[PDB]
Each structure stands twice: as C-alpha cells, then as structure tokens.
Write a protein that binds this ligand. Structure first.
Ligand SMILES: [Cl-]
Ligand SMILES: [Cl-]
Ligand code: NA
Ligand code: NA
Ligand code: NA
Ligand SMILES: [Ru+3]
Ligand SMILES: [Ru+3]
Ligand SMILES: [Ru+3]
Length: 129
C-alpha cells in the first residue's frame, strides 16, 4: 500500500507515534517519506547483506528475521515480511523499540540527513488529525 501523506499521519497518530520519545508526528511522516515514499512494500538490500523493510525501512541486521542475514538479531520478534503489510501496526511497534534504544531517530539515516533540523511540521500541514 502507498499511503497518502495525511492518511499516514493519521495512522501513525492512532498508533501512538505523535510525540513518542519526544518526536512530533511530522518527524515520523518525514522519515517515512524519505525512507519508503510511504510504500509499505518497499525493500532495499544493504551492502552487509541485510535488508531494510517497509514504510520505515527497518533493518534485518537487528530488528526482524528474514532468514538470510547471518549472525543478525530479531529484536522486534517478527518476520521482516510483517513490516510490508498494509496495516502499519508491526512497523510502528518495532519503530517504537528502535527509537527507544539510545540514539533516537538518528537510527534512520534519511531522517538524520533530510528531516532533522527542518520544519517537519510541514509534513502534517492541512491534515485532519
Ligand atoms: Cl492512492
Ligand atoms: Cl508526499
Ligand atoms: Na500518537
Ligand atoms: Na535478523
Ligand atoms: Na489531536
Ligand atoms: Ru495513489
Ligand atoms: Ru491525500
Ligand atoms: Ru505525495
């Protein structure tokens, strides 16, 4: 599923991401825009052999099991395919664990390079929240 901008903002708010670990809703929408273009089915292989999955490009090196990332962890206790569903629950719940691990949203390279320090509130402008 490719979400609309305001549709995803609303879904993320329902699932408790607005101000989660202090990160306003616009940060999460911005991160999803640049990680996946709001496409739940996005997958991208990393140089180390791991793969990033879903709207927030969650990495199999640490967070989910894809059966093909030797020596990796599965800290969200989910198959990586669960991060590709039209229902964003699994991605949101795993993202909550990631953002709580110490480095905040810096875990997401696209957030660090394209959202951090910007007027992220623009990503939710006009949306009925
Ligand atoms: Cl559409
Ligand atoms: Cl957009
Ligand atoms: Na919320
Ligand atoms: Na893994
Ligand atoms: Na509100
Ligand atoms: Ru469309
Ligand atoms: Ru729309
Ligand atoms: Ru758009």
């Amino acid at each position: 599923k490719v979400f609309g901008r305001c549709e995803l903002a609303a879904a993320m708010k329902r699932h408790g991401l607005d101000n989660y670990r202090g990160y306003s809703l616009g940060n999460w929408v911005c991160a999803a825009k640049f990680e996946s273009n709001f496409n739940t089915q996005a997958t991208n292989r990393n140089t180390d052999g791991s793969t990033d999955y879903g709207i927030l490009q969650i990495n199999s090196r640490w967070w989910c099991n894809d059966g093909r990332t030797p020596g990796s962890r599965n800290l969200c206790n989910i198959p990586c395919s669960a991060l590709l569903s039209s229902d964003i629950t699994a991605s949101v719940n795993c993202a909550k664990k990631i953002v709580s691990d110490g480095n905040g949203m810096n875990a997401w390279v696209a957030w660090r390079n394209r959202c951090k320090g910007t007027d992220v509130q623009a990503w939710i402008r006009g949306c009925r929240l």
